[PDB]
Scaffold this active site. Structure first.
Site, short mmCIF file in Angstrom:
data_model
loop_
_atom_site.label_atom_id
_atom_site.label_comp_id
_atom_site.label_asym_id
_atom_site.label_seq_id
_atom_site.Cartn_x
_atom_site.Cartn_y
_atom_site.Cartn_z
N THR A 248 -43.26 -18.24 77.04
CA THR A 248 -43.46 -16.96 77.18
C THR A 248 -44.62 -16.58 76.53
OG1 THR A 248 -41.72 -16.68 75.48
CG2 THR A 248 -41.15 -16.26 77.85
N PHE A 373 -39.91 -7.27 78.18
CA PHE A 373 -38.95 -8.14 77.30
C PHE A 373 -37.40 -7.67 77.63
CE2 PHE A 373 -42.91 -7.43 74.94
CZ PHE A 373 -43.37 -8.81 74.40
N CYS A 380 -35.58 -9.12 74.54
CA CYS A 380 -35.97 -10.24 73.93
C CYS A 380 -35.75 -10.02 72.38
CB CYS A 380 -37.30 -10.56 74.32
SG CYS A 380 -37.90 -11.68 73.32
C1 HEM Z 1 -44.50 -12.72 75.21
C2 HEM Z 1 -43.36 -13.28 74.74
C3 HEM Z 1 -42.00 -13.17 75.54
C4 HEM Z 1 -41.64 -12.47 76.49
C5 HEM Z 1 -42.43 -11.89 77.49
C6 HEM Z 1 -40.12 -12.55 76.33
C7 HEM Z 1 -39.19 -12.20 77.24
C8 HEM Z 1 -37.91 -12.40 77.32
C9 HEM Z 1 -37.03 -11.61 78.34
C10 HEM Z 1 -37.54 -10.97 79.61
C11 HEM Z 1 -35.61 -11.62 77.63
C12 HEM Z 1 -34.38 -11.17 78.64
C13 HEM Z 1 -33.83 -12.49 79.11
C14 HEM Z 1 -32.66 -12.03 80.14
O1 HEM Z 1 -32.44 -10.87 80.59
O2 HEM Z 1 -32.26 -13.03 80.86
C15 HEM Z 1 -36.01 -12.36 76.74
C16 HEM Z 1 -34.73 -12.81 75.82
C17 HEM Z 1 -34.80 -13.39 74.70
N1 HEM Z 1 -36.06 -14.04 74.23
FE1 HEM Z 1 -37.87 -13.89 74.69
N2 HEM Z 1 -39.78 -13.24 75.23
C18 HEM Z 1 -40.94 -13.62 74.66
C19 HEM Z 1 -40.84 -14.77 73.37
C20 HEM Z 1 -39.84 -14.88 72.59
C21 HEM Z 1 -39.97 -15.35 71.45
C22 HEM Z 1 -41.22 -15.66 70.47
C23 HEM Z 1 -38.51 -15.70 71.21
C24 HEM Z 1 -37.94 -16.35 69.80
C25 HEM Z 1 -38.80 -16.77 68.68
C26 HEM Z 1 -38.03 -15.07 72.07
C27 HEM Z 1 -36.38 -15.28 72.06
C28 HEM Z 1 -35.65 -14.74 72.98
C29 HEM Z 1 -34.10 -14.89 73.02
C30 HEM Z 1 -33.37 -15.54 71.85
C31 HEM Z 1 -33.64 -14.05 73.96
C32 HEM Z 1 -32.16 -13.71 74.27
C33 HEM Z 1 -31.65 -12.46 73.54
C34 HEM Z 1 -30.10 -11.89 73.63
O3 HEM Z 1 -29.92 -11.95 75.00
O4 HEM Z 1 -29.66 -11.74 72.59
N3 HEM Z 1 -38.51 -14.35 73.06
N4 HEM Z 1 -37.12 -12.75 76.23
#
Ligand code: HEM
Ligand code: HEM
Ligand SMILES: Cc1cc2nc3c(=O)[nH]c(=O)nc-3n(C[C@H](O)[C@H](O)[C@H](O)COP(=O)(O)O)c2cc1C
EC number: 1.14.14.1
Lengths: 438, 152, 439
Positions: A248, A373, A380
């Site tokens: 991502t 996000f 996220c």
């Molecule tokens: C530009 C970078 C990133 C984008 C665009 C992004 C986007 C996303 C999106 C759209 C979600 C929602 C997922 C869903 O509804 O099914 C999410 C959740 C998540 N992302 Fe990212 N992410 C990014 C990078 C990161 C990074 C760097 C980490 C970790 C160190 C991270 C950790 C997570 C986690 C753990 C979730 C789940 C949170 C939860 O449901 O409690 N993400 N991300």
């Protein structure tokens, strides 16, 4: 059908509008693309996160870490409240130094290329984001920029995710041709678990611990139970951060550089800001915070190609959407973030234009109009981490080098769980400015 | 294109590289330089142009490729060194107490008590300190001494 | 007379038979010299000249008539020697210095970035260091060895062709069909070496070489004697020659040096104290490397015990007598066993086998021809100042930035090829956390 489903669903959105339905035996899915309906789908008393098939397949090695858990699962809320402080803007200060540590390795690799060579952009950016989460997360060095073949963990992680994604397009999963895939799959899980399970125990026995995600997890407690996550879930969360942030974030950086070399006067403006603000050999945390136009460049790349292009929801009960589309309890909604980001009654008439200026006044932007996000408590958790990494790295990139689109790259967007500018390459021309770590 | 012959006395190449360096800068200054060991022009000192003599010392003695020259120089004096317009650069080490630059010195002053056209005062290099400083001082001063002397 | 460690076998024999002994093959007579007095005599250039051993003749198949694999009377040895000698001077080292630090910084940074449970492969990392260092200083080219598992294609081919050449020396049956893949692989490696270096030379001629490195000097250099410069082909053979003459010799020096330091911890402590006093900027300057006097002594004492090019060969130019006792015919071979010379008790004392850097505290105290790790006369190592500059710099930075551990209690095992190396030498580095250029 297609290897590029989200881009395909976008074209259909272009023709059918803000909602349309696909149906299979048992499964009905509606695809949402206007701010008007998505705004309703984002009401968490009405809709909750759904686990698509992709996430179910990723769950085989990510288990009940945050990303592939149901909201109702015990380990979700517990991990969510324990790790939330570790990901706040405040916590970014404490990750900055190690962030810079890997960002320097990136810039020094490019400084050290021979003039006839070129840069593999998504490739290098994935190297950087992977090593950054490893070091900032649990003080572990993959040393990706020292290798041709990635560290065994990374090889397996990448291979297991690929297999998870490939499993989705498989007509005959139990064909004997897939027997090796299956064994390799189990081999990769063991590799991942064995490495992460070991790092955890070593730290537990460690009598001089740190202040990274691993120590925050080892010491965090569930308010009610008064206990922390058990070591298996912690292992699942570690694998989860690598999985969820590696491509991502690297995609963001890749698209952002793409749009800059294609929009040279925007590159210049971004580069003029890096030069003015990054006045020390190594960037400081404050300085990264002063990179506002680099911050807007990234937000505009996220707007046009958010690298986690879709999220899935389910109706928690019977309800009506937009006052005219009835839903049954359990009906899945799919949010097409790139379509949303092109909603003309929100962003105006030039939605395919790369205009970082759109983000000049964030207060201008209506709730649920920009959602790269995700949404609400299932958003996220790594948004700050990601944006701090990308701002820091893009800034250092723009400070130290001029970029040439020597091949005149034609955008080709590969879709997996994430988006990336497949085969995007460039040439860097040093401005010959030294840094930290040389 | 005046004739610049550069002779060396060297065992480990310090003096020989210095000599060849000189011959390289001469070429840049239009000379017609020639490089050879010292004890190979023993008696055959150039009666025209000038001869740069770059040599080390070993415990007070000439290097293996310079012994024939010096001996020829020491005893033999009959075949006078008149006409020979030279200059001497010394490669030495202060770590050698009582013998410091003894061979370059011998050659320099002996050449003169036999009819010298010493166009440029000797130069010394101490390996134990700033050999390129002194080598640099002697060189710049050197080109000019020979400049003014002949042509420009 | 088989064994994979001939020099070591020959020192053992020298301890039994003394300053000279001879082996004979159907048409060959070889005498091996171990004493300072006989070697001193054999290093009289009017009486003896460099001989090309079989090994050197095998390496000539890819190193061509570069300096190392040439006979003294060859046109191109004379030319190349006359043209390059000033580019290899101690003063010349001042402009190579910055690029040496460049690669030295990469070595230090690699060790800083290691995780606690990993270790260092010493001769392996010193070789990456020295190969990249020679490429960058010599012809502005980055092999970036520290960014790969598999070396740059040139390096892979060079190391393989040299290993092939060494192997030929022990092939009972070279023409056995099993050596067929070897023979064609050999030609392929030669072609990758030639092609890359040729291209670099051609690009530079075209580029107009706005640099000031060995390649610059070789394209622009003029042999006074003949008035002509080196041709493009010989220039390429000289570049191939610098990498092969210099990568494992220097490699081994730094590795034996670190070996003796961790085996002799009080010596380590004393070198570390000097590196800490002298290296006061984030990166060493040229002047500071020249102040690393004890580090220098450490390096000479490791070269005394295990000089990494441990033997060189000579031939009698005319029939003559050695030591007033040993008749030689024109063309007879003399092999100098440098580690034996370095153990001559009549010169060094009885304690020859002891690691004692203090031996070199007084240079005037060492007689001529007692210490010859870099060979002899006009055929001595042209790279001597390059190598000692690189090693003093790098060893000084190593000692400034880390403490070291002989975590396996390594048992010295000296592998013999064209060179010597402490095979399998591994250590653990513990950072003193001093930034090399800033945080
Ligand atoms: C530009 C970078 C990133 C984008 C665009 C992004 C986007 C996303 C999106 C759209 C979600 C929602 C997922 C869903 O509804 O099914 C999410 C959740 C998540 N992302 Fe990212 N992410 C990014 C990078 C990161 C990074 C760097 C980490 C970790 C160190 C991270 C950790 C997570 C986690 C753990 C979730 C789940 C949170 C939860 O449901 O409690 N993400 N991300
Ligand atoms: C500590 C390391 C080194 C040692 C111990 C060493 C030793 C020697 C010795 C013993 C010789 C003479 C071989 C013979 O007589 O057959 C030699 C020749 C040579 N060395 Fe080295 N060497 C070292 C490093 C270097 C380096 C770094 C370079 C290159 C930059 C270099 C370039 C060569 C060349 C080209 C020759 C042949 C010179 C001629 O005959 O004209 N060596 N070296
Ligand atoms: C064994 C030995 C003896 C030396 N004796 C003297 C000496 O008597 N006077 C002196 O000035 N330097 C002396 N030196 C220093 C050398 O002259 C100095 O290293 C010279 O630069 C070497 O030059 P070369 O490589 O051309 O032979 C001696 C060096 C050695 C190794």
């Amino acid at each position: 059908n297609t290897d590029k489903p989200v881009q395909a669903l976008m074209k259909i959105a272009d023709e059918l509008g803000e909602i349309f339905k696909f149906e299979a035996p048992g499964r009905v899915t509606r695809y949402l693309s206007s701010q008007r309906l998505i705004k309703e789908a984002c009401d968490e008393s009405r809709f909750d996160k759904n686990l698509s098939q992709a996430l179910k397949f990723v769950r085989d090695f990510a288990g009940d870490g945050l990303f592939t858990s149901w909201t109702h699962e015990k380990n979700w809320k517990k991990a969510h409240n324990i790790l939330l402080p570790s990901f706040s803007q405040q916590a970014m200060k404490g990750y900055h130094a190690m962030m810079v540590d890997i960002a320097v390795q990136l810039v020094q690799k490019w400084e050290r290329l021979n003039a006839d060579e070129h840069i593999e952009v998504p490739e290098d950016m994935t190297r950087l984001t992977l090593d950054t989460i490893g070091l900032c997360g649990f003080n572990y060095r993959f040393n990706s920029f020292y290798r041709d073949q990635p560290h065994p963990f990374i090889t397996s992680m990448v291979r297991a995710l690929d297999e998870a994604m490939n499993k989705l397009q498989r007509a005959n999963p139990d064909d004997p041709a897939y027997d090796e895939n299956k064994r390799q799959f189990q081999e990769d899980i063991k590799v991942m678990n064995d490495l992460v399970d070991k790092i955890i125990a070593d730290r537990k026995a460690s009598g001089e611990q740190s202040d990274d995600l691993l120590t925050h997890m080892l010491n965090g407690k569930d308010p009610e139970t008064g206990e922390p996550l058990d070591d298996e879930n912690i292992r699942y969360q570690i694998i989860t951060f690598l999985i969820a942030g590696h491509e991502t974030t690297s995609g963001l950086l890749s698209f952002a550089l793409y749009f800059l070399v294609k929009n040279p006067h925007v590159l210049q403006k971004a580069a003029e800001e890096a030069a003015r603000v990054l006045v020390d050999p190594v960037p400081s945390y404050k300085q990264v915070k002063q990179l506002k136009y680099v911050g807007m460049v990234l937000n505009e790349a996220l707007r046009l190609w958010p690298t986690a292009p879709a999220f899935s929801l389910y109706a928690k009960e019977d309800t009506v959407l937009g006052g005219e589309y009835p839903l049954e309890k359990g009906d899945e909604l799919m949010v097409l973030i790139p379509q949303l980001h092109r909603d003309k009654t929100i962003w105006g008439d030039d939605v395919e234009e790369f205009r970082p200026e759109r983000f000049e006044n964030p207060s201008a932007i209506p709730q649920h109009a920009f959602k790269p996000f995700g949404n609400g408590q299932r958003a996220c958790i790594g948004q700050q981490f990601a944006l701090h990494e990308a701002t820091l790295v893009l800034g250092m990139m723009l400070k130290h080098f001029d970029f040439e689109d020597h091949t005149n790259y034609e955008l080709d967007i590969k879709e997996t769980l994430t988006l990336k500018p497949e085969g995007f390459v460039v040439k860097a021309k040093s401005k010959k400015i030294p840094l930290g770590g040389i | 294109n005046t004739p610049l012959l550069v002779l060396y006395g060297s065992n480990m190449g310090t003096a020989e590289g210095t000599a060849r360096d000189l011959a390289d800068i001469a070429m840049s200054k239009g000379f017609a330089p020639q490089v050879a060991t010292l004890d190979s022009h023993a008696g055959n000192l150039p009666r025209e142009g000038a001869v740069l003599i770059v040599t080390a010392s070993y415990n007070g003695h000439p290097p293996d490729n310079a012994k024939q020259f010096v001996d020829w120089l020491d005893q033999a004096s009959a075949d006078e060194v008149k006409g020979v317009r030279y200059s001497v650069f010394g490669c030495g080490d202060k770590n050698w107490a009582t013998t410091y630059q003894k061979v370059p010195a011998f050659i320099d002053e002996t050449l003169a008590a036999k009819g010298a056209e010493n166009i440029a005062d000797r130069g010394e290099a101490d390996a134990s300190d700033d050999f390129e400083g002194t080598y640099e001082e002697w060189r710049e001063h050197m080109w000019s001494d020979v400049a003014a002397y002949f042509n420009l």
